[PDB]
């Protein structure tokens, strides 16, 4: 019967990259399974396929929705099994699918109940994963390395530890060359994220952008894109660059981005109270991911916007009125906030204190003079070495 495929899959046991191909259909090889079909392996018995059939056990259970003996299985079985696979080199590639599930249910298990047995257990877990993270690191199997790394990163962020994961990266070198683009984007995802929480944005949008590029699409790969982009909007927003509407209308994902689509409406307008109200509105929704405490940083940005708009639309304004448009209590509050905005290269103004009105700087003629010469000159040179550079990297033909 259908077990022929399981035997046909064993016909993939010849050598080397076949396993790769062997995995591909094996991705969908789990469509049909039965406990009596389990007896197939009972009649089938080799170890190099023993671990694999254990994969089939995990896949069987997790899909069958029973997680108890899946993790229980992970321990009692995988540990004996784990020792045998260490000797093998090919097995490391196979185990990655294994590890991918191992952590999973355990993580998923945490959503059943709270116990410190889960703590000690997962301390053991991470400990192991770092152990043969080093072991495999010396064994030079790119794929299983990258996978494992991803799993422990995801552990740090199921935890609250960004730093430990960060300094962890500091001592990491990533198995760059030979990867699975999906794992690559899981990396770039987590990377961009933690790199953001630490308040460095300008490198986060990078790694998340790559998490958009390197990610596959299909119909299944959605949730990763949905989730990521739910982050990408946040970074784009914090950095001070409003995203365009079409970014909010793309695919099914547009139903999820809605709170962010209610943030930019709050942000672009620069109206604080509306913002805050919205944050209270969608808060719980924003907590199911951790984008929340990112978003609550925007209270700075929103006000920056408020000031910049009040500047572009007025040459000079009595402090009274700015304080009215921004709802704030006191003028004294204002000139702290505006004095701040100026230093950041936003307004380009000065402030008249004794009359208390902002005055924004003008263009002051001067075209008939030589200043345009200097300016154009700088711009010119800075165009040259662009041309230069683009011809120095050009050398390759």
């Amino acid at each position: 019967x259908x077990x022929x495929x399981x035997x046909x899959x064993x016909x993939x046991x010849x050598x080397x990259x076949x396993x790769x191909x062997x995995x591909x259909x094996x991705x969908x090889x789990x469509x049909x399974x039965x406990x009596x079909x389990x007896x197939x392996x009972x009649x089938x018995x080799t170890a190099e396929i023993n671990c694999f059939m254990h994969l089939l056990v995990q896949l069987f259970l997790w899909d069958s929705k029973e997680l108890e003996q899946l993790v229980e299985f992970n321990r009692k079985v995988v540990i004996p099994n784990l020792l045998c696979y260490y000797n093998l080199r090919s097995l490391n590639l196979i185990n990655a699918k294994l590890w991918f599930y191992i952590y999973l249910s355990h993580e998923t298990l945490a959503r059943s109940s709270e116990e410190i047995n889960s703590d000690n257990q997962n301390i053991i877990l991470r400990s192991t994963m770092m152990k043969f993270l080093k072991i495999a690191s010396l064994k030079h199997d790119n794929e299983t390395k990258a996978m494992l790394i991803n799993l422990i990163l995801r552990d740090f962020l199921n935890n609250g530890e960004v730093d430990s994961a960060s300094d962890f990266i500091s001592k990491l070198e990533y198995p760059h060359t030979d990867v699975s683009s999906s794992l690559e984007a899981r990396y770039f995802f987590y990377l961009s994220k933690i790199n953001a929480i630490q308040l460095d944005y300008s490198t986060a949008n990078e790694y998340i952008i790559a998490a958009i590029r390197k990610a596959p699409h299909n119909s299944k790969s959605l949730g990763f894109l949905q989730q990521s982009n739910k982050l990408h909007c946040c970074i784009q927003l914090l950095m001070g660059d409003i995203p365009e509407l079409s970014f909010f209308h793309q695919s099914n994902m547009q139903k999820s981005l809605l709170p962010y689509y209610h943030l930019t409406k709050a942000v672009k307008l620069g109206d604080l109270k509306k913002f805050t109200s919205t944050i209270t509105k969608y808060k719980q929704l924003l907590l199911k991911d951790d984008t929340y405490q990112l978003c609550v940083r925007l209270r700075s940005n929103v006000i920056k916007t408020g000031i910049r708009i009040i500047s572009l639309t007025y040459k000079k304004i009595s402090l009274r009125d700015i304080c009215l448009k921004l709802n704030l209590d006191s003028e004294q509050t204002v000139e702290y906030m505006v004095s701040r905005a100026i230093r950041d290269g936003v307004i380009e103004a000065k402030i008249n204190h004794e009359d208390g009105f902002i005055e924004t700087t003008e263009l002051l003629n001067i075209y008939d003079s030589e200043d345009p010469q200097q300016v154009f000159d700088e711009r010119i040179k800075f165009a040259n070495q662009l041309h230069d550079e683009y011809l120095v990297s050009m050398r390759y033909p």
Binding site: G160, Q198, L199, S300, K350, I351, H353, N384
Partner: protein
Amino acid sequence: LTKSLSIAFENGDYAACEKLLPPIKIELIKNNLLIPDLSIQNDIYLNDLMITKRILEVGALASIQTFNFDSFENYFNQLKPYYFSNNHKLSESDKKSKLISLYLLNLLSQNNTTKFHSELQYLDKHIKNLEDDSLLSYPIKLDRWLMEGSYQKAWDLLQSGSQNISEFDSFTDILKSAIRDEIAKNTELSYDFLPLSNIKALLFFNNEKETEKFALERNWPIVNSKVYFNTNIIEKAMDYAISIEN
């Protein structure tokens, strides 16, 4: 030894505490090789961890006045398993409630923002039962207000640490200066012209002379209460050419 620390902190002198710590550090080296990191999760073992917590606690509290800050971060790092291992018995000591807040505030004092927000994200999942921020709003709120740029509320918090007051007053004197330059570094570009009374108004001085003290320290030329805050074309052508004909 084991009673020595009791005599140090119960003594109430934190230099006696201070220099009384190093001789304890050794039995904390052996016992360190025994008690800490609590991997055994043993029930009868409760005594070791019970004492150990308070040991490092007065390690930090003492470390404050003694400028030993980083060290107790270590201690605080070392303390991390204790309050953040879930338990009712293990995580209780109010030296937590004051100590954590002390730590966050440290991070602000050093202008390390990255580490600070990282810590926020950390504490969040643990404290997630969190009610507002009870004591802990002092460092948090203290951060948010200077993030937005409204200082007056922040300074107000600096006046509001005295209720729970501890030696972070020193930190206060840190943070206080840490703010004023800001306003200074703000106002330098704000507008060129100030009456002295207004500088006093901004920088939160209770004194008129502290002003020009600061402004001299800032190199600000002062006028009687009122301060002020302040290639030929041929060449260019040939330059464009020689850039073109390379």
